[PDB]
Amino acid sequence: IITRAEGCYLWDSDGNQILDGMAGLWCVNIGYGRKELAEVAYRQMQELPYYPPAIELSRLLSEVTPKHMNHVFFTGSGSDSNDTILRMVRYYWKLLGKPYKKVVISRENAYHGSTVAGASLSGMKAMHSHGDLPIPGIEHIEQPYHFGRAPDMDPAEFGRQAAQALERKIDEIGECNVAAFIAEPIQGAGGVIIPPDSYWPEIKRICAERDILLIVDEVITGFGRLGTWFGSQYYDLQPDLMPIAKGLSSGYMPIGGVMVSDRVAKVVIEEGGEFTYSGHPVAAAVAAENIRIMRDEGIIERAGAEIAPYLQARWRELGEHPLVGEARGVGMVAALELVKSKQPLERFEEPGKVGSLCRDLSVKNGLVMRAVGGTMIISPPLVLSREQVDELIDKARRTLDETHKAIGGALE
Amino acid sequence: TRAEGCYLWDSDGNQILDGMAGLWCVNIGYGRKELAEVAYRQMQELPYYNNFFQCSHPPAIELSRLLSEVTPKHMNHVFFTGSGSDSNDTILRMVRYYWKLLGKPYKKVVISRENAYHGSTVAGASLSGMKAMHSHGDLPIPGIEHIEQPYHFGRAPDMDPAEFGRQAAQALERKIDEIGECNVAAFIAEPIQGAGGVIIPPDSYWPEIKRICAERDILLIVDEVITGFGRLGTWFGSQYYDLQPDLMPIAKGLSSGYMPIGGVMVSDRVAKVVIEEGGEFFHGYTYSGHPVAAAVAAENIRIMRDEGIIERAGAEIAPYLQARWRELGEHPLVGEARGVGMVAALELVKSKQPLERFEEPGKVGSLCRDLSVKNGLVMRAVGGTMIISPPLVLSREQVDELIDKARRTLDETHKAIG
């Protein structure tokens, strides 16, 4: 229960300075305590609560987004973005005369939204059972999770394997029934599932020989999360559509959006114009300001220049702890792995509860940090300073140590 | 693009009376400076609401207490979401998953009406009845059916309304006997259809439908995205047409337009079940779409119930609006003036006594809408059907304003066509 929140810190009803390593929900990229936003909202509510903010917002988004992404359809949340995506991908092919080409393909343990459509896309089999949630035209392949899937196959080789999974499904369904393939650059919600560096190279190959669109879900990855403006350009992907949201406002306003490549855009706008526009004047004003800040203060550049590479090595230095098996780390996102043993490699029995115990103990020490099973993940704001990465390593250290004896002693 | 009260000024100092409440949303009118203060306030504190680490004074707490006060007695639990179109995607999920936990997983069908609107997501455009939306790919997703709209004008213009009302409402019973009673999960409708012209049902309809949903074993879902927060002169159209809905999405009006908000009111009946086994029903959004949105909305309702905007609607200015409007029924092109509370429609026809609709009525309405704003009125058209939802802060001197601008507009379209 916080009472004060600025910079990378919160403050309980007790007054401990808890450091938000998670950045709320992966989204307060420019950090708490920016009154510069709250004023642009105040004065945008004076002007108009309905409908200008949508235009200046669209300008900045075409500057920061590479490639042929020059048009943008805003929405209320990234959960609604993926809906528009699915709809306009089938609409794309329908306006090409291939209306049977409507099958979009996700991965297992990927997250793409809470809406019926987004949840059908999202591969959390927890969300899928409750009501009918594999709405016709969504398929689920393997995730490029090295640790979990094949912890001993060579990353170089395991990587090719998890992408040709895509090609396997394609040849299974009918290349002409597949509309597109969608996937987070790095699955965030389902733990930090970083793919090997052979994965996206093959995906790009499959999405060229087999005529499908690539859709890349940049909701957690967008707006600096990987030390680049988008996970897109950090893996040299040239997507056809990107749902952007959490980063947009840095977490202060409900705004979602889809970036569209000129390929899909042209057909949708020219041979269509019947699919109305924009999002919400307030939240757009607010969003366009958070990007001004990030652009002039360059804290996206600082994100790569200074605080990322430092935060990678330091995190990797956590991998030697007795509990830590793997120490994944790309840009301002990273993750550890809680295993009973490393040399014998015994995967913790029900690691859900043990990782839930480090989270529980991580705030007792004064660190925000998410568990997902036996995976401790972090996603600090892009304003975190090189000094505070040391605050982070230190408070994780005590936590893992405390839990190293807590299961190997107290009520084992 | 500046706005003050019920007026939208633009570049050339053009005071345009907004008779559309933007999009049925801006209810307490524009230029309520005290909402900006509550957004500036909350925005300065935390901007998320996870079960680990809450806020000082959680806004969704205040809000969800208030929504219990102004909603039908038996509704007392509110999930929040990002917009009202999200609210229905939730409801589709809830109504179904309600039966799975009553052990009837084959009970997954939702029935709507054609030309009903229910969101713009893949499910809200499946639910919704315009086939424009259905034709993109195949937006009708399984589980949904559609029955006939009780649109007395375009369906059976000469029938007896209480007869026809009773006839379009046996439609529901006649989809159940075609579908199988144990398959149907629920039936969802707006108290009055909004975005598809204002389809004011014959009084004898909601009477019947409540019976059909007693006799049959189905939940009920009343879409109050538009009818909610005073539109019908009652807080919710439910109270207007004495409906007791098991779910109810709410939205446009929750924040009177000021902030992206959605929400679903769960009747005690369905709530009892979705709580016993609800650890499974844990999704990313959970509740509290945004503390800032909730903070703003909570104050919005403060302003609404304390100055009394809902009450002076259905008791003072709504009556006035209805009377004035119907003085337009006595016009050449106009061959019906309907409305309730704070919503109203004019039908345009090529001849009154020979009831003769236009070859392509849509285009005439586009003209009228183009001619309304020219003369200084926001007035939307659904085909050949003009509609209006003025902000509930409307003053009498301004429905007078609202009527005369309509009069010119109708007299200029009458010229233009002839």
Residue numbers in the entry:
A (entry chain D): 36 to 86, 95 to 318, 323 to 459
B (entry chain A): 38 to 455
How did the manuscript describe this experimental structure?
Herein we present the development of a PluriZyme, TR2E2, with efficient native transaminase (k cat: 69.49±1.77 min−1) and artificial esterase (k cat: 3908–0.41 min−1) activities integrated into a single scaffold, and evaluate its utility in a cascade reaction. The reaction proceeds through the conversion of the β‐keto ester into the β‐keto acid at the hydrolytic site and subsequently into the β‐amino acid (e.e. >99 %) at the transaminase site. It presents the typical type I fold of class III ω‐TA observed in known structures present in the PDB database, and it contains the characteristic pyridoxal‐5′‐phosphate (PLP)‐binding domain composed of β‐sheets and the catalytic base Lys289.
Diffracting crystals were obtained for TR2E2 as well. Datasets for each crystal were collected and refined to a resolution of 3.3 Å. Only purified TR2E2, which retained approximately 80 % of the original transaminase activity (k cat: 69.48±1.77 min−1), was capable of hydrolyzing pNPA, pNPP, and pNPB, with the latter being the preferred substrate (k cat: 0.41±0.05 min−1). This variant contains two mutations, A172S and Q173H. The RMSD between TR2 and TR2E2 was calculated to be 0.71 Å between 299 of 389 C_α atoms of the aligned residues, indicating that no large conformational change occurs due to mutations, as also confirmed by the transaminase activity assay. Notably, the distance between both active sites is ≈20 Å, with the esterase site being more solvent‐exposed and located at the beginning of the tunnel and the transaminase site being more buried in the protein structure. Thus, the insertion of the hydrolytic site helped stabilize this region by adding two internal hydrogen bonds, improving the thermostability of the enzyme.
